[PDB]
Amino acid sequence: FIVEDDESLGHKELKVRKGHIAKLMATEYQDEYTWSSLLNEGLVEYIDAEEEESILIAMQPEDLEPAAKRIRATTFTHCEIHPSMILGVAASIIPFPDHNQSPRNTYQSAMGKQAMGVFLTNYNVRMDTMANILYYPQKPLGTTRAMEYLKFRELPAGQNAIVAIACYSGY
Amino acid sequence: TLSHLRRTNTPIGRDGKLAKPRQLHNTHWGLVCPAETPEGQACGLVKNL
């Protein structure tokens, strides 16, 4: 997101606005803004790996924007879109990944590619070497926003089961 | 399948050092996933956008 400096509302603000985002939601539910149509008037910017040596980024769109839960500069030029989009495809499936250890994330991101579920829908047509389809593939009760874009809710990985963290004597 | 489509790889050589590109770098932020990597002989060598 690009952040203009001088606002007639005083302090500092990012240029995109509620009217624009309403127009976006209307375009979505039409089922004629695009991403490109949002580009062509200076609302977002593509930034390579180097201009970060020339710019300044805000986490939230509120973090310094007005002048028992969690512990959380006035020259911002950009604010990032959403901090959860520093992740990758596999790691966007781990629920609450900010609430555990990083090597555990790395293991899970390795193992998830070995999971089985569906993989496509024309699988009744495609001859293939080895295929693995399970019976009753359920979307997960917990979820995050990204796996909506990953179409993962449409093609789930496994089933969800009732667990119990006990030591029932043996095994 | 999606993870395999977006996937990057570099060559290094035989053994290599430590602070050479195996370890994660500051500049990697927001571009390459700081969580995924295969472990063993490729950690820091094969990365995903």
Partner: peptide, 30 residues
Amino acid sequence: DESAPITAEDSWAVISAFFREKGLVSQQLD
């Protein structure tokens, strides 16, 4: 208003627009 700022929840609309345009394998295709 239309010119009010954006609460952080709303940006998923922008993300939806981005993905609806580009897709995911867009760099390969491009």
